[PDB]
Design a protein around this ligand. Structure first.
Ligand SMILES: CN1CCC[C@H](CSc2nc(N)c3c4c(sc3n2)CCCC4)C1
Ligand SMILES: CN1CCC[C@H](CSc2nc(N)c3c4c(sc3n2)CCCC4)C1
Ligand SMILES: CN1CCC[C@H](CSc2nc(N)c3c4c(sc3n2)CCCC4)C1
Ligand SMILES: CN1CCC[C@H](CSc2nc(N)c3c4c(sc3n2)CCCC4)C1
Ligand SMILES: [Cl-]
Ligand SMILES: [Cl-]
Ligand SMILES: [Cl-]
Ligand SMILES: [Cl-]
Ligand SMILES: [Cl-]
Ligand SMILES: [Cl-]
Ligand SMILES: [Cl-]
Ligand SMILES: [Cl-]
Ligand SMILES: [Cl-]
Ligand SMILES: [Cl-]
Ligand SMILES: [Cl-]
Ligand SMILES: [Cl-]
Ligand code: NA
Ligand code: NA
Ligand code: NA
Ligand code: NA
Ligand code: NA
Ligand code: NA
Ligand code: NA
Ligand code: NA
Lengths: 396, 396, 396, 396
C-alpha cells in the first residue's frame, strides 16, 4: 500500500474502481473528455502491493466569487476507496497529498460535490451553495400582472434542437458564469458531454429540447417514467426578461402536469405567479463545497458589500492562521497578527461563509463561529453577504 | 344578501358554516375561548334574505417586528363563504368592510394564515414568514465537537408532563415572542387550548411530552400512524445553549427513527451536526401574511439595519400613497410627497418585505418592485433585512 | 344440524355470528331497528346438536320497477355460515327453505346485495342495477353554458345539519323512490339509522352535512384520512334543476380537491361540465340482485317501452316454466304454453333483464340467453329497456 | 404569424414540434407511413415571421356508422401549438381553416381522439365512443356452463407469431370494421406500423403474441414492469364463438395474475364467467369524437332502429341549420324548414348521439338537448340507439 501519481497503465484499474464506485459513471470514452481537465500530477492512486484500491484527483476550474472575481479552483473529483480497503485511512492519505500539491501549485481554493454530507467537513470543506428543487403544478400557474413579457406581439423564445444552437448556449452560459457567484467556466469537452447527454438513449432518458431567448436558455426533457413531469436540466438567464420569458414557455408545456428544476433559494419564479405556493420546494441539499487553501489570498480576492461601513477585527482559523481583517469600500485587507482573536472558526466554516450562502449569525448560533461581540457578527453578516444570489454551475 | 355585525343568535349559524368550511374546527366550547380575542364589531356575517352564508372577523393581536417593536395587529380569521354562494363577491365585500373597520380602529397592520396561496395578494396581503419543515434521521445524528452542552455533569433538560409546568412554558414563550420578529402575544385562553390539545384523544393524537430547559422548551408527540416519527409541535429557545440542549434531548429519543419540526429557514440545527444533510427540508410554505394598513405608521415603527448608511428615496405604494422615505441610524422617517417615485410596488409586496423574510432584489427580479437604480435596491435589501431571523408564532 | 325459525333466545347467538361475519355490523341496539322489517317466520337458523352455525332471513321491502309499479319484495339479508361449518351445504339448505316461504307468502320477487359476485347466480339471482363511482377533480370543474341554475339572484340550495331537516329528506326520498326503477321504500327505523350514522364518531367518520333543495338533497362528509376528499353518501334529486343546483354547491366545496359519489351509469353529471372527462369512473360493481319468484306475475306487473310494436314469443325459464309472452302498448300478458320455445334463459338472466340495466343482446352474445331469431332479440332489448334510468336505493 | 399549407421544407420543423408535443411520437421514418393518409391540402402550419409554431391536419378515413354504412371521414390529427405561442388563438385559426377545407371537400363528418376532454366541444366535436378497461383476475376465472366452446375435441384457437399471419389478421379486421359502428378501414401502412410495434424493443415493450381463430384474433404482450399482467392491445371477433374461444385462451395464460383490455361498455366478457365481478372496470374515458360537418347528409346516411314507429319533428342545431326530421322504417329524411324547433342542441351534442353511445334522455337531463316533449325524447332515444354496440377502432 503506497501512494503514487498514476501512469497511463493505471487508468484501466481506475475506470474499474470508478464503475464500481459511481452509478453515474458513463464509461472510458466519456472519461477521456473529463481527463483533459486533470493537470499533470493532478491525480493520486493507491496500489495494493497490483490493482488500484484508492484514487483521487483535482481538475483545473475557474470559479466566480462575489465582485465578479474569477479564482483558479482545484475541483476535487473521482475520489474512491475500494470496498475491500475501507477504514485503512486511504481517503485521509490521498486528501493530504492532493491538498499539499494544490497548495504548492498556488490554488487559493479547492471545491467539490459531496456524495455524503458527513465526510468532507473534517478535511476543511464547507457547503457553500444550496440546491433548491422547485416543482410547479403548471395546470394552475397564472403569471402576475407585474411579470415581464405578457403583452401583444411575437414571442422572443424559440423551441429548438439543442445540438443546432451550441454556439448560442455557450455564449449565454459564458455571460452567466462571469456575473454569478458559484459560476464555473465550462470547457468545450463538457459542452461535448452535455449535448451527447441531450439525445434519447434506448431504454434510458428521453430526447432533450431547448427554449432559446437572446439572453437565456432552458434545456428540458420529459421524465423516463412520469410522462406528465418535465425536468429542466439547466436554465441560464442573464436578464429578468429572459428568466420570465423562458418560464412563460415552460408553463406553456400544456401536455405536462408538473415542471421540476434544481435552482437556488432566491429563484424569483414563485413571485412571477399569482399563487407563489404553486412553486413548491420538494428538495433541498448542499451544492458546491469550498476549502479555503490560502485564507488571506481568498479573503482579499472577493468583493464585500459597500453598504457596511469600514471595520477591523482579528480572525483566527483553527490551524489555518490568525489575521488582522480590515473591510471597507467593498475590499478586504488580511495581514498576519499575533493580536488577540475576536472571531474563531474552523476552515470549513469560512468556506461556507465565502460565497454568501450562509450567514455568520446562523453559524454563530450553532457555535461553529465564536465571538463575544454581536455588533461584529452583524458586520460580518452584511460584509460577506452577496448582492447577486449564489447559484450552482454544474456537478463534477 | 346584506352585510351585518353578528348578534349572539347568529353564532350557531356561524359555527355550522365553520364546521363545513374548516376540517380542523374543534367545536363551539373551544370556539368560546377564541371568541374572547374578537373585539366588539370585530366580525361581519352575510345572511341570505335566514341562515349565515358568509362570515369574517379579526382578533386583537400583538406582533413583534424588527427592533423588538410590538404592533397592535388585526388577525383576520374565521373567513368562510358557503359552498352554495361562491362567485357572488361575498369575500370582497366582507374584506372591504373589515379593512374599513381595522383602518378606522387605528391598527397599523393586519395579518392572516392563508388556506390557499392565490386568494389574499389582491386584498394587499403579502407572505411575510416562511415555514420550513426539517425531518432529522436521528439514528445517524452526531453533534459537532463545537456544539454547546456536550461535556460531563448533569443534563439541564427535564422530561415533564406539559400541564404541570404551564407557568414555565408561558414565561419562556413571553421572553421568546418579545425578541423575535413574527412573535405573537399568546393570551391565557390559547394556553388553555394548547394544553388541552396536548392530552391523548381516543382514536386521535397520542399524549404530548415536554422537554424543559430554564431558557427553552419543546412539546412533542409520537405520530398517530408512523410510530417511529416524533412530531415537535413547538420548540421555543431564548438562548443557543437552550436550543442545542433541547435538540440533544430530542436526538436522544432512541425508539424514534425520525424527528420532524416546522421551523424557519435560519434554524441553526443542521450546523449542530457533523452531517448537515441529516436535517432534511421536507416541506416549505408561506406562514404569516401581512397587509400594511398605514404605510408611514408601519415603516416608522420598525427598526432598520444600523450597518447601511443614511439614504433617502421616494416610495409609491399602488393606490396606497407616495412617501419621502429617509432611513438612517436604524430608524425611518416616512412623509407625504408628490416628488417623482424612485420605487413602486403593490401593497402586498411591502407586507412581504416588512419582517425581512424576502429580499427587495428577489421581488425586483420578478418585477413586483420597480426601480431604475440598483444601488437603491442594495440599500433597501440591507436596511429591511432583520438581524434576528423572522419566525412564525402560531396559526390563527 | 337442523333448520328452524329462531326463538328470542337464538338472537344473541345470531348477533355473535353477525359480528364475526360482517365487518360493518354496528351491534345489537341497531340490529333491533332492522329486525322490525323481518316478518314472523322471515328467519331461519341452523343449530349444531347448542350454538348458531348458520342463519338467513328476508325483510319486507317495496321495490319500484319500470312503469312506476311498486312490487312487494323479499330482501334476503343477514346470510352467514360459521367458519367452522363451511362446505356442509348449509347455505343451499337455508336459501331453499327461505325461497319456499317467500314463494308461498306471495312475493313476486326476492332481492339482495352480494358480498361476492360468484355465490348467488346458482340460486336464481341476477345482478339488476350497476353501481358507478364518479370522482370529480372539482379544482378544474367549470359548468357548461347550457347547465341549469347559472344566473343572477339567490341560491335555491341551503347548507344544513341533517337531523334538523329529517321531514324534508323523507318527503324528497319518498318522491324519488316512487318514480325510479330500483327505488325502495325507506321505513322510519332506517331514517333513524341513517341520521345516527350522520354524526361524528370518536376515532371514526367525520360529521355529515346536507345540501337541501326543494326537489333534492345531498348528504356528504369529508373522508376519515384523505382530508381533501368529500364523499357524497347519498344524492336524491326529483328534477334536473335540483340535480344541477346540488352539484354547483358540491363543486363549491373550495377546500376539497375531489368529490366522490356512488351513482348510476346514466348520471348526467359529466354532461354538466365543459370537460366531461373530469367526472372519472373510479369503480363499477353490481348493485341490487333480483330473483324472479313468479315469472308471469313479475313480467305482467312491470311496464314496457311504448315505442316497440306489439309482438308475441315463447319464453322458457330453465326449471321455471314456459310462457306465451305478448308485449304491446307498454303491457305484457304471460300465459302457460307447451308450444316450442323461441327464447331460453336461466332464472338469474331474467332478473338481470327485469329493471332494464342489461341488454338481452349482450346476454345473448354470452349465450346466457338463447334464440335463433335476431329480430326477436332487438324487440326484447327495446321492450325491456327502461325510460327512467335504473338506480340503486340503499344496501341491506 | 401567417397560416399556410406546408411545403416539403416545413416537415422537419413539424416533426420537431411533434417530438416536443407528443410523448408517443415514434419518429420521422414512421411519420412517412402516416403521411400517405394525409391528402394534398390536408395540412396547415403557422410560421413565426422561420420556424413552425403551429400545425394541424386531417387524414382520409372510412368510418362505419349504424346500418353498416361507411362514411368518408376527415380524421383530425397532429394538432400542436408550440409552448412559446399559447393563447394567441392559433388552434382556433387552424381548426377554422381545416373545417372550411373539410366541408368544401365534401366530408359529411370529421373525427379525432382528444388529448384533453375540455378542448374540442367548442369546435363542435362530441365524444361518440366510450373506452372501457376491463382487468380480469384470471386465477379465479371459471367459464359459465352456458359459455360457448367448453366441450371435448381440439381447440379452434392457435398461439402464433403476429408477423407470420398478417393476411389472416387483415381479413378478420376488414370483416369486423364493416359490421361495427366506430369501425375504421385500416390501410396497409398502419398494418406495417402495428406489426413493427409488436416486436420487442431493447429497454421497451416485450414481444407480442397472437391468439388466432378463423373468426377472431387477440394481440397481447406481458407488461414492461408488472410481469404478472398481460395487456391485450387488440381483440377483434366477428362471432360470439370466436370472442369466447379467444377469452378461454387468454384465461389459460396460467403464468399471469391479471389480463387487461381496453374494450367497450357492452363487452359480453363479464357474462361468460360464473363471477361477473372478476371482470373489473378499472378505467373509463371518451374514445372517438365526431363533428357532424353536414347535418342532413350525416342524419340521412345512417340507419335507425326499425322498432320505433314513424315520427316527425323539427331539429335546430345551434348555428348549424334547422331541419324537418322524419324517421321511419330505419331511414331518416332531413329537409330545411323555418317551422318552430321542437328539439335544440349544439353541434357537439349531435356528434355524441350519432353512433348511439349516449342517450338523448341523458343529454336532455344535463340540458345539452332542449325539448318540451318527453315522448319525442323517448322516440329519439330508441331511433338513434345502435343495434350493434359502438366500439373504438384505433387511435390516430
Ligand atoms: C460522480 N460524479 C457525481 C456527480 C456528477 C458527476 C458528473 S460525470 C463525471 N464527472 C467527473 N468529474 C469525471 C472524471 C472522469 S469521468 C467523469 N464523469 C475521469 C477523470 C476526471 C474526473 C459524476
Ligand atoms: C382554521 N384555522 C386554520 C389554522 C389553524 C387554526 C387553529 S384553530 C381556531 N382558530 C381560530 N382563529 C378560531 C376562531 C374561532 S374557533 C377557532 N379555532 C371562533 C371565533 C374566533 C376565531 C384554525
Ligand atoms: C352486511 N350488510 C352489508 C351492506 C350494508 C348493510 C347495512 S347495515 C345492516 N343491514 C342489515 N340488513 C341488518 C339486519 C340486522 S342488523 C343489520 N345491519 C338484524 C336483522 C335484519 C337484518 C350490512
Ligand atoms: C398522438 N397520437 C396520440 C394517440 C395515438 C397516436 C398513434 S401514433 C401517430 N399518429 C398519427 N396520427 C401520426 C401522424 C404522423 S406520425 C403519427 N403517429 C405524421 C402525419 C400524419 C399524422 C398518436
Ligand atoms: Cl467562473
Ligand atoms: Cl480515511
Ligand atoms: Cl411578477
Ligand atoms: Cl409580540
Ligand atoms: Cl369575492
Ligand atoms: Cl456545532
Ligand atoms: Cl318502491
Ligand atoms: Cl352450500
Ligand atoms: Cl350542461
Ligand atoms: Cl369503416
Ligand atoms: Cl386558440
Ligand atoms: Cl356464459
Ligand atoms: Na457560501
Ligand atoms: Na444553487
Ligand atoms: Na417579511
Ligand atoms: Na417561520
Ligand atoms: Na336489470
Ligand atoms: Na345504481
Ligand atoms: Na355516439
Ligand atoms: Na369503445
Amino acid at each position: 500500500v503506497t501512494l503514487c501519481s498514476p501512469t497511463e497503465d493505471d487508468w484501466p484499474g481506475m475506470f474499474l474502481l470508478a464503475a464500481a464506485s459511481f452509478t453515474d459513471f458513463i464509461g472510458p470514452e466519456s472519461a477521456t473528455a473529463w481527463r483533459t481537465l486533470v493537470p499533470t500530477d493532478g491525480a493520486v492512486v493507491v496500489r495494493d502491493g497490483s490493482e488500484v484500491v484508492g484514487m483521487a484527483l483535482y481538475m483545473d476550474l475557474r470559479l466566480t466569487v462575489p465582485g465578479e472575481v474569477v479564482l483558479p479552483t482545484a475541483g476535487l473529483s473521482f475520489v474512491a476507496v475500494a470496498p475491500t480497503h475501507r477504514r485503512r485511512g486511504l481517503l485521509r492519505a490521498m486528501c493530504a497529498e492532493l491538498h499539499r500539491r494544490i497548495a504548492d501549485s498556488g490554488y487559493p481554493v479547492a471545491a467539490l460535490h459531496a456524495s455524503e454530507g458527513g465526510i468532507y467537513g473534517r478535511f476543511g470543506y464547507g457547503p457553500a451553495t444550496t440546491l433548491h428543487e422547485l416543482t410547479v403544478d403548471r395546470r394552475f400557474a397564472r403569471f402576475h400582472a407585474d411579470a415581464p413579457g405578457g403583452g401583444l406581439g411575437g414571442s422572443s423564445v424559440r423551441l429548438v434542437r439543442p445540438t443546432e444552437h451550441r454556439g448560442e448556449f455557450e455564449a449565454i452560459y459564458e455571460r452567466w458564469r462571469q456575473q454569478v457567484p458559484g459560476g464555473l467556466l465550462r470547457p468545450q469537452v463538457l459542452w461535448d458531454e452535455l449535448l451527447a447527454e441531450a439525445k434519447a438513449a434506448p431504454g434510458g432518458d428521453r430526447e432533450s429540447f431547448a427554449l432559446l431567448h437572446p439572453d437565456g436558455y432552458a434545456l428540458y426533457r420529459v421524465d423516463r417514467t412520469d410522462l406528465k413531469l418535465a425536468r429542466v436540466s439547466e436554465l441560464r438567464a442573464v436578464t429578468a426578461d429572459a428568466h420570465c420569458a423562458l418560464w412563460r414557455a415552460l408553463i406553456g408545456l400544456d401536455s405536462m402536469e408538473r415542471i421540476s428544476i434544481i435552482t437556488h433559494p432566491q429563484d424569483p419564479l414563485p413571485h412571477l405567479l399569482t399563487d407563489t405556493r404553486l412553486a413548491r420546494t420538494t428538495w433541498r441539499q448542499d451544492g458546491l463545497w469550498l476549502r479555503i487553501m490560502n485564507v488571506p489570498a481568498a479573503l482579499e480576492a472577493r468583493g464585500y458589500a459597500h453598504e457596511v461601513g469600514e471595520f477591523s477585527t482579528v480572525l483566527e482559523v483553527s490551524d489555518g492562521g490568525r489575521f488582522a481583517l480590515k473591510i471597507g469600500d467593498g475590499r478586504a485587507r488580511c495581514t498576519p497578527t499575533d493580536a488577540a482573536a475576536e472571531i474563531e472558526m474552523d476552515r470549513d466554516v469560512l468556506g461556507s461563509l465565502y460565497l454568501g450562502a450562509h450567514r455568520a449569525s446562523t453559524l454563530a448560533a450553532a457555535n461553529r463561529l465564536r465571538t463575544k461581540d454581536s455588533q461584529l457578527l452583524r458586520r460580518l453578516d452584511a460584509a460577506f453577504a452577496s448582492d447577486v444570489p449564489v447559484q450552482t454551475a454544474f456537478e463534477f
